[PDB]
């Protein structure tokens, strides 16, 4: 018959997270078969960046603690899994961190790079004191989903990385009108991420995954 092809991208950015988008007026009945399909693609596989290995020049294993700091090595590595890192033209970089004195080590203390961008700068990593300091190297990579260290000289500390920028996806279906038909609906995605990827670029990336799985059909 006749179908109205949705060709529009209306993104309402209120903050770095929770970006509400509205694709276009869909056909009658395509609000749920296309909205639930896009939700199962975003929450499943979206490229992200995560720290896969951290090397500290003072500690051997993640269980033994270091002097001068307050958080344990396990607590320090668990704080690295909440970093929002964005890579532009590289697939695997190597960051470093070195701070002394009685200062709260945050995500902004990492050495700046041209192809590395950190969204969260107030993320507390560790708390130091006048007794000692810490110095470590960070290695991030590109991935698609959850990959533990078991499925992936003695100072190498591997971490279970989760390459998923999306956190919560919800969709509602309302009524639309283009002065052409009577029964037309629009789709509104309440996409919420960690601020790494663009919400307008996530829809074009999710539409390509669905189209590639149907081209071979």
């Amino acid at each position: 018959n006749e179908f109205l092809t949705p060709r529009h991208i209306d993104v309402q950015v209120v903050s770095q997270t929770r970006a509400k988008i509205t694709l276009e007026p869909l056909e009658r009945g395509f609000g749920h078969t296309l909205g639930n399909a896009l939700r199962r693609i975003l929450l499943s596989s979206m490229p992200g960046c995560a720290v896969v290995e951290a090397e500290i020049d003072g500690v051997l294993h993640e269980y033994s603690a270091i002097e001068g700091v307050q958080e344990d090595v396990i607590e320090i590595l668990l704080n690295l899994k909440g970093l929002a890192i964005k890579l532009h033209g590289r697939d695997e970089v190597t960051l470093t961190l070195a701070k002394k004195g009685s200062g709260v080590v945050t995500a902004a203390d990492i050495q700046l790079d041209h192809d590395v961008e950190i969204i969260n700068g107030d993320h507390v990593i560790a708390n130091l004191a006048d007794n000692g300091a810490l110095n470590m190297k960070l290695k991030v990579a590109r991935g698609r989903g959850y990959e533990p260290a078991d499925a992936r000289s003695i100072g190498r500390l591997q971490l279970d990385a989760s390459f998923s920028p999306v956190r919560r996806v919800s969709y509602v279906v309302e009524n639309a009108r283009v002065e052409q038909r009577t029964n037309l609906d629009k789709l509104v995605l309440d996409l919420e991420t960690n601020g790494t990827l663009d919400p307008e670029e996530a829809i074009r990336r999710a539409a390509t995954i669905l189209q590639q799985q149907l081209a071979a059909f």
Partner: protein
């Protein structure tokens, strides 16, 4: 008043009123790190 807090030990400075002898007084608490239990579990203490 707590003097210094470390991940492995906590040293406090005793107040001027709660001292038995005629000196300052310093209490040092060593925290138990990762040790083995009778049921092969982990036991460790974290400062608060």
């Amino acid at each position: 008043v707590i003097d210094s807090v470390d991940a492995s030990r906590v040293v406090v400075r005793v107040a001027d009123d709660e001292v038995e002898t005629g000196e300052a007084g310093v209490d040092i608490y060593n925290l138990t790190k990762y040790t083995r239990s009778n049921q092969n579990t982990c036991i460790n203490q974290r400062p608060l």
